[PDB]
């Protein structure tokens, strides 16, 4: 059998594991959406085309680097690459665009390299004149209060926490420190101050500018950096302004406080990013996996998208093949229950961006087939409280029906994505094919595992009921074309009693 | 809270038990249908009316007693009592009629100048069992006549003969030319025409005698809804019932009564071929050791639950009530446990056929079943059923389970289903929703037969079809709601799950909708 | 296979039910202890001997009736019957003796000219209930007198009044200047001095009257083992029993009978303070609606199972047998379901106290309990208990669960425990092993009280201590094995789990060993 | 609370996940043993001392490289480093030594292979040590070179270019490699292992039961004691796994080769399947290769590496390995310290509730008194949050049977057999203590002194504190195979 079905029929998790079969070919669209960071390696229209073809679903713009003009070019190229496939509506793949916020970063000064000798004296300055006078015994940083916040005996991580510094006297013109971990240091590198309370705002003048930019260029999603408390996302919301309620806000969890106040942060956000990079510097590297698995679990419970991020395939920045740990990282993110998996170096600057995307694609398909739905579904139902919202009620119904007949797909009409979401919330195995007129909602829905958006272009029919049927039919055809559904398959169709959003309430079983 | 909801939310069966609350009032129509046997105590139109009011859903005609004329009067009186409530379609309660077959019984003769007189079989004495036609009526303390010619040829020396609900006990010591010389092993007081059981003897009597066949044809002609088939031992037995029922009667549901060891052993083959099962505890309780019935009962109920077929629990559920206005503590727990076991219907016999409290007896099964229905640990039950039931490609099943699931998620007060033959109402109840299954149908018969399936409340719909089919569909669903409101099944603010189909005719159910009342 | 093993190996409760097998013979001592009530039917030494042979483990003396002298004779006769088997220590069966308290009973008066004669209260007729001192003797078909002046003040117009076991039903339709003008709801033949109940109406008689205290002091002096304490409504009720029991009687296990609504509601507090519980169905079934008892029964048994305390199921489990040599189908299933519920003991009252078949009645509870015990789905049962029971630091508990676990893994025939006060035997049964708990003790009393715990089979050990303690330990273990072999609990080639301790005196169990027989 | 106890008390796996707490400090010896490969970075006695201190439990000698003399020096150095702590029997840490077999490898001879260009096999000329290559790769066959980084399609054509070094691993999937599992050299290497008293054989390229039979034959009679760990490195091996496991003492998920022989996407499936099956069989299973590669070069692991380790433990692995990280890299001790740190966190996060349930449930009934005592002991341990289960064991088997059920309390195994003490590291949760005193006259006393020994060693290393409960497992008579007693004692 295929799809790891013998494994799906197991009575225990152990028996399940014991039955995973390397010769059981996956046989389903991959449900985990891939987010790819745009950079020099992935910015040319022709490259983007390849990346789309290979599996990219979300383009991530990292506003930690590049000017407004630079990101506008990125948006313009993505949109071009994406619309090059509009020749065939039945095959067209929407691509989301996520603005990633700079946030309260700290960076060293200005392709040369100094060497911080272990045990040696290094001075950290925020004096404007030393802004480029950086050397083996002097590092300049762009956070003037550094001197006010890192006390004697405090730690200062530099460059992915690879360099490490102990403050051994805080004198007038800077921090007198001793290198604890040396390393070959380069230009403008990221700095971390664990244990220190960085009074740096979650939203600086630039972030606000950057957000307004996102509104004007119609970005779909904000990955909000360094989110430490509910008011942080409120601030993002305010900045996003009224022209931008539609925009999904994904809070990146990058530090201890963020981890601790996670519950409050989730309730107020549209989803979460396990921001492992910073997280892995702010808390001990041994402990990330706990935060990751805790947050993914909690999101699964709340029904919100969760993203797993950073170094999932690092070696690929430089090599055509991933390390054995990277492969298992991707699979375990999926098995953890992550809605999306990300790429950074691997697609922004590396020598194999398309190969990197093909790999997340390949692994996610295997891992998705290896999900023990039986336990998963049971636990979700069991944990999720009762509900009175007809849309939820239909969803779980639909998912249940899908399971009973091994439906190829659940086809949903949706206006804002919400009813597609409520379906994927319960993790059907059948694919959730979402038919929508809202180009934006079609993009934002990539954030939810197992949704395949289809953008519908025809003008409304006179008779609403007809309009509904043409759309469902549209789903089926697109379905047939991309090999999601074959003649003789059963499909579950979810619709509503009247137009407008918020009235989903019907579930139907149809045969193809 | 009500409906034993704290108990419903328990994480284990033990925790569930630990949270059952005597002050949590049930709050739902009772889902276990009650079958009542018709006799002198329950035959008058006015009595029937009371029994309907009290909860009766199936009238059982016991063809072991009475003539054709006698049962025709019963049917006529039921139907009258039933139709007396047709003045209000929104409140009308359909009542099924079940013909219960005589089958291969054996009874003693009539007593010497005494149909209502008693002889006494003393422990340790010689009793001759005769088949001699001349002794039918001549029977005494040392002589009992029996209506089974072959008895003399089937009980060996050392073989046991039970008389009267197994309370009398004879052991064959000598066989002879003019009967069985027996010694009374258990004595007691004996009357006329009492049931005989022959465990250990293979009884070569047919499952369907010339009379049964006549009885069955009778059932066809008078439009009975259900056949409780006695002494069903193997698949061919129900085939025989089917043939006899003839072509004028495919619609009739066949319920095999399981009354003996062989029947218990070939149960699987019998179920596959029957519409449902009756755990016939009376005979079963004599054919196998009394200690073992509970095992057959729980096994069969379990298996039916699995197959999704109606199962009936029967006999002595409330015996003391034949004679007393209150049940014994075992009787009460018997009913509750039949329900908790997972029985679709519970029966009454003596209690409604001859006893002094037939209505009180019906009211009691009503009261207990409501409590017990609320105490079912659906969480486990539902999980196990899904888990056990094979995948399915039939859109009707698919919608059913969907509907049940949706119902659970919002504590739906009801699932309302349009159904033509009952099948989609049945597939719902197969998954044991807690929300009541309100089945709307134009088939008066299907409305009656549906009582066989736990949790289905049938509503007979009387209006002529609208021109636009979609409108006809809506009026029906609306009809369900209103009836619902009126009988306190649904209150304003409830959510309800509506199940319908894409086109007319049966077999095409495939839609599930969430509506608020 | 035997012992319903296929059914034990099932992955779900449903599959379990589906695999119960009527041909799978039980093969194990029955673990549910049987309490028999002593009366005219069961007071003769020779009868008692039969009842012991048949399975009785606890004699229950019902102090609601009979004088001190009368109960002394009962004790004497039991002890005589019991010690008649002392000729063989390997086979000797200890029998507990439980004193059942009268408590705050409410009663009717003596009849017009008839300490034996009878009045009929006809359904629908006017009935005056006086509290008038004069009429305590002047009762007829329209006048019943009652020994509780306050009844007039507590039952409001429209309230019920149940009489004699709840078989007679009166409704107050007028409160008058000397009596409640009642209509007869339920009719029937009324006797002299019968029990009256007042549901919903709150009562104010003490839990412990001057007589109870006397009765308790009596129990001490005659060395009763167990007090079944009637009408326990709150923790202080058992404190009172404890005080009355006096210092000569800490050893005595106190079982609170739960007989009313308040008792049901304050159950948690009552359990914490008692050694065990009695589900007193009789009264309970009159105080709260008859439909609801099964809920109180299953909730209490569940909670006791959780707490690890003995729970008894009681009253009417086999009533028809008071009068008939076979039980009704409901009675059989009642017993099975008590066991499946998880009851430690099952009781008999009328069936053994007055009826015509006391020994047969005891043989039946024995026969059913064995079947039902084999049908427990231990897999779930064990899982749930572990899961629910909090961590523990007491080495005795820790050894128990370990022992139970080891037993399961090798289908041990038995767990053999040395115990001084019964406590380590109890902690084993607490986890419901399937293997039998063979408890070896020198305390004749502890040997009796242990019957209160499902699955414990006490063996009284008589030899004087050896010089070397270790040797004394081994002879006792060996004693268990031999007794074991002799009664067919263990066969050559069986594995057995032996639980002992590091030093003498109670409270130090901490060793578990696997041995082969 | 500590040890992720709130998460242990969860009613579902989801709820469990939801309750993992980064501020819940682990508080227990780490139970996953660490296998470290010896090389230039890790061969000096002083280095070895550091690596023992940091957590190493098994030294891995990779016979794919180095001469006999070279491996003798390694053994010698390990043994020295190890015995330098013998100053104190209560603290002494035994270190196993595992001989890792070369087996049917293929390597290149002693340059950048351009994408597109011609390359013959016997810059435009790679040499290979497997003469039959010409015989088993047909027109349109694939030849991987160096950790599957290069790809050659058959005369070949380069499909994937790359920078080629000296003597590098060649892989041929789809081809049936008729090279023997045991060459003349392997046999020599194995005989070597016997003579120098290695403890464990990691047997390379195990494809079928007869492969381990061959290893067994070569190991000879002087070496029945030696535990044999079959390395699963290819498709056939994955397919015939059941047969292989039944006949082996344990398994190594040899990800490196496996990741080249089967698609990289699929390894995690083989890994989780094998670890699951081993957990079921009660045999040790090893997770291997690249668990921390970046550390070969960098002082900190990547985020994928960290999660790789934790997931191996959560998968249920008995041991985790390091190769380049400790054999040649610039951070061997840091690498060992990391596997130590992660394994402790991951171990505390195991959802025993489910795990234990499932193992009981799955494991068939048993009549062997040792098993019966084990499960009993584990059950007792759970009920009182025992700090430890202390077992007397002669061959390790009763320690093994305990760990088979994954207690959370640590399994402190007391033994006289120095070797058994070493091999027991293969079983999660076993902490061996070597006992040196001569037997007492009264056997019962000898038993007690040993149990007492375990307690004291326990106290000293902070496994058990006064007031803890401990579970003690012993037997009714001397000699192995008769464990049958379980006792609850307070410290
Ligand atoms: K950023
Ligand atoms: K009949
Ligand atoms: K009493
Ligand atoms: K090797
Ligand atoms: Mn970051
Ligand atoms: Mn019958
Ligand atoms: Mn009472
Ligand atoms: Mn390898």
JSON list of N, CA and C and ligand atoms in Angstrom, two decimals, chain D residues 60 62 64 100-102 105 204 231, ligand 4:
[
{"chain": "D", "resi": 60, "resn": "UNK", "atom": "N", "xyz": [34.64, 4.45, 19.77]},
{"chain": "D", "resi": 60, "resn": "UNK", "atom": "CA", "xyz": [34.44, 3.78, 18.52]},
{"chain": "D", "resi": 60, "resn": "UNK", "atom": "C", "xyz": [35.71, 3.79, 17.67]},
{"chain": "D", "resi": 62, "resn": "UNK", "atom": "N", "xyz": [37.22, 3.05, 14.14]},
{"chain": "D", "resi": 62, "resn": "UNK", "atom": "CA", "xyz": [36.72, 2.90, 12.81]},
{"chain": "D", "resi": 62, "resn": "UNK", "atom": "C", "xyz": [37.77, 2.27, 11.97]},
{"chain": "D", "resi": 64, "resn": "UNK", "atom": "N", "xyz": [37.80, 1.33, 9.04]},
{"chain": "D", "resi": 64, "resn": "UNK", "atom": "CA", "xyz": [37.87, 1.82, 7.69]},
{"chain": "D", "resi": 64, "resn": "UNK", "atom": "C", "xyz": [39.17, 2.61, 7.44]},
{"chain": "D", "resi": 100, "resn": "UNK", "atom": "N", "xyz": [34.65, -0.88, 14.89]},
{"chain": "D", "resi": 100, "resn": "UNK", "atom": "CA", "xyz": [33.72, -0.68, 13.75]},
{"chain": "D", "resi": 100, "resn": "UNK", "atom": "C", "xyz": [34.32, -1.17, 12.45]},
{"chain": "D", "resi": 101, "resn": "UNK", "atom": "N", "xyz": [33.66, -2.14, 11.85]},
{"chain": "D", "resi": 101, "resn": "UNK", "atom": "CA", "xyz": [34.21, -2.90, 10.75]},
{"chain": "D", "resi": 101, "resn": "UNK", "atom": "C", "xyz": [34.29, -2.09, 9.46]},
{"chain": "D", "resi": 102, "resn": "UNK", "atom": "N", "xyz": [35.32, -2.32, 8.65]},
{"chain": "D", "resi": 102, "resn": "UNK", "atom": "CA", "xyz": [35.36, -1.70, 7.32]},
{"chain": "D", "resi": 102, "resn": "UNK", "atom": "C", "xyz": [34.24, -2.25, 6.44]},
{"chain": "D", "resi": 105, "resn": "UNK", "atom": "N", "xyz": [33.26, -1.67, 1.59]},
{"chain": "D", "resi": 105, "resn": "UNK", "atom": "CA", "xyz": [33.34, -0.30, 1.10]},
{"chain": "D", "resi": 105, "resn": "UNK", "atom": "C", "xyz": [33.90, -0.24, -0.30]},
{"chain": "D", "resi": 204, "resn": "UNK", "atom": "N", "xyz": [29.60, -3.48, 9.79]},
{"chain": "D", "resi": 204, "resn": "UNK", "atom": "CA", "xyz": [29.20, -2.70, 8.63]},
{"chain": "D", "resi": 204, "resn": "UNK", "atom": "C", "xyz": [28.50, -3.53, 7.56]},
{"chain": "D", "resi": 231, "resn": "UNK", "atom": "N", "xyz": [25.00, -2.83, 11.66]},
{"chain": "D", "resi": 231, "resn": "UNK", "atom": "CA", "xyz": [24.77, -1.52, 11.08]},
{"chain": "D", "resi": 231, "resn": "UNK", "atom": "C", "xyz": [23.93, -1.73, 9.85]},
{"chain": "E", "resi": 4, "resn": "LIG", "atom": "K1", "xyz": [33.28, 1.61, 9.04]}
]
